[PDB]
Design a protein around this ligand. Sequence first.
Ligand SMILES: Cc1cc2nc3c(=O)[nH]c(=O)nc-3n(C[C@H](O)[C@H](O)[C@H](O)COP(=O)(O)OP(=O)(O)OC[C@H]3O[C@@H](n4cnc5c(N)ncnc54)[C@H](O)[C@@H]3O)c2cc1C
Ligand code: HEM
Ligand code: HEM
Ligand code: HEM
Ligand code: HEM
Ligand SMILES: O=C(O)/C=C/C(=O)O
Ligand code: NA
Length: 568
Amino acid sequence: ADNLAEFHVQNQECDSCHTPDGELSNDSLTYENTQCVSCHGTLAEVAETTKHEHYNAHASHFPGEVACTSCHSAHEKSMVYCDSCHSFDFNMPYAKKWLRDEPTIAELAKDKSERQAALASAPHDTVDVVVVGSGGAGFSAAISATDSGAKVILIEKEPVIGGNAKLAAGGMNAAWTDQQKAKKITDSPELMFEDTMKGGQNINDPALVKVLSSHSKDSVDWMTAMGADLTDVGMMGGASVNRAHRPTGGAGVGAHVVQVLYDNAVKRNIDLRMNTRGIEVLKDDKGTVKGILVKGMYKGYYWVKADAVILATGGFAKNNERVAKLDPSLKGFISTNQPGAVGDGLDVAENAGGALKDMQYIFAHPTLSVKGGVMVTEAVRGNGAILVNREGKRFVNEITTADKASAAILAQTGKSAYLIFDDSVRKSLSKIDKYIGLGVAPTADSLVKLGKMEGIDGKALTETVARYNSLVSSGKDTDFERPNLPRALNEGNYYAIEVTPGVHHTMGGVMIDTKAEVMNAKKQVIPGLYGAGEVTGGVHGANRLGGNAISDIITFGRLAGEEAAKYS
Ligand SMILES: Cc1cc2nc3c(=O)[nH]c(=O)nc-3n(C[C@H](O)[C@H](O)[C@H](O)COP(=O)(O)OP(=O)(O)OC[C@H]3O[C@@H](n4cnc5c(N)ncnc54)[C@H](O)[C@@H]3O)c2cc1C
Ligand code: HEM
Ligand code: HEM
Ligand code: HEM
Ligand code: HEM
Ligand SMILES: O=C(O)/C=C/C(=O)O
Ligand code: NA
């Protein structure tokens, strides 16, 4: 057979997969995926038949219910979504090599044609609020508007939910929580605000940073009431005390928080549409929002009539061409992001009149795995790991800010460095087990052996760990001044992870005020239009602290949903 449908119709009728009239149920292909499942079983049952020791196409870290048509199309060859970040040995029937080629909003002008007919038609749906983007900000705003009494439609352009938010690892910053008090940490919204401003070189908008610090406990309480586990609190770069919250044991905050938000939307019967791209915000004759034109992958163009539109589309760190125009030093670097994080949401916001700010400030995360090409969390250093160069020595304060960490690594021989830690660090953070499963953390029972394995001077590395453990012991790093020294590297085996910098987060974006209303260049509100999460600029200034973006999307998403519901 040349394709999956052809294969099955050798022994089955068209209605084994299609509805009685044959039309596709919707852009999420709900009815059609139910038919795949009635014969093959759920995703978990199929995964029983495709096990591999350390990976499995049908059982991954992605949260929610991943549709089969995400990777298996019927009438044409299709791509394995996992190939956008990894290179596992896979053999999916009727596959083709991963290639992302999505037209820009500008290029979709070509469809003037079909777009005009859609806009001349009656709205396909009439609701109060439309949220664009199924990341942490978009789910938060959809739930909060629904709880406030508004009828919502939430759209996602990708086949799977969660965007970059489902990948988060190290934590969600918040201050003065019940969770901190239980671990005996002392902190305050005032200290979180100060760390944040100084971390961002005082470019941040102070009014947005106050919303960030003052609503932070409330956002952790809201998530926990909905079923989240945020009881583990860790340290991240540039913070005065531990304040990065995550599940018990040090698991990834990201996949868990998005699973909780998805379960909660499903319980409220929230109309969630996949493979549906927001294209153009529509305004009436007095310039207030009247709806949004969308492009359904399977259904075509249509518009939804509504009082308010909330843009929660995330950043553009996967778009290296746009990144390089703003920061020529990052051209050619690998990204940590999902394949659709390209900035099309920003183009939608600007075409609607929104102005942008702080676009030149791009976060380069210092520690991508050279071997695996994926982010390695900053919590590995927060929980006690060190960095060494090819000469076997320390060269930087490992919990300094992302900008300084990346420069110091690129100044080392070969332009990369190695995280070094032991089994005490490994056991304090369950996420480290995931790196070991991926095959990017070689280990040995002595540093001489480890060094020999990875090309690091063995006797210098042994001396380096011995000296660092003495500094931990006495409580002061006189070589590089790391202010937090939580563990000696001396329990069980040793591990090494080769790391180098990659493109990760864009701190600029659409201008919003403290009620998350989008503004134009004269600082006027555009009525009915909201922005929440990494699509916005002004919260993080010149350098974002680790843990502050998950805090941002929950706070600003929830706020935007409440404000849109009230507005109408
Ligand atoms: C690997 C990784 C780990 C991270 N770890 C952390 C952490 O531990 N702590 C932290 O503070 N931050 C962390 N960050 C940053 C944080 O996860 C992101 O800043 C956050 O994902 C922004 O969430 P969001 O809701 O704004 O956008 P996203 O979560 O990116 O979601 C936006 C969604 O919008 C959809 N979308 C875009 N354009 C359109 C359109 N036109 N129509 C419809 N849908 C559209 C996208 O496809 C996407 O699904 C991490 C980021 C990554 C990549
Ligand atoms: C879009 C929907 C579906 C998907 C993604 C899917 C997936 C697949 C795949 C990947 C294969 C292997 C193909 C090959 O070896 O070339 C397959 C085979 C098969 N499918 Fe489907 N399927 C779908 C719908 C269905 C339905 C509705 C039925 C039954 C009425 C069905 C019954 C089977 C059977 C019987 C086989 C042969 C192997 C076996 O006996 O399990 N499938 N399917
Ligand atoms: C000869 C039998 C079939 C006919 C005439 C038929 C007809 C069609 C048509 C016309 C479309 C496109 C609809 C649109 O864009 O509006 C479509 C799409 C689709 N069909 Fe079929 N179909 C048949 C068999 C199957 C089978 C056997 C399966 C599953 C194994 C299947 C699953 C799907 C899916 C998932 C889509 C969405 C797009 C894609 O994945 O290619 N169909 N079908
Ligand atoms: C319940 C949902 C799904 C169904 C029913 C389905 C069905 C199947 C079947 C029948 C096979 C053939 C394996 C065999 O029989 O040896 C297969 C293989 C495969 N599927 Fe799916 N699939 C689903 C979802 C997905 C998703 C979401 C993805 C990607 C994230 C995916 C990617 C693949 C890959 C890569 C293979 C080949 C596995 C390997 O080489 O180890 N599938 N699928
Ligand atoms: C269904 C699709 C995917 C599968 C089956 C998969 C598989 C895996 C596996 C086997 C690991 C090692 C640890 C573990 O066992 O969980 C892993 C880790 C990782 N993957 Fe994926 N991957 C998928 C898609 C992606 C994509 C598209 C991205 C990036 C946008 C990504 C980012 C990462 C990261 C950052 C890690 C490191 C460990 C962690 O943060 O938990 N993965 N993945
Ligand atoms: O876990 C991390 O390395 C990323 C933290 C962040 O981007 O805030
Ligand atoms: Na931003």
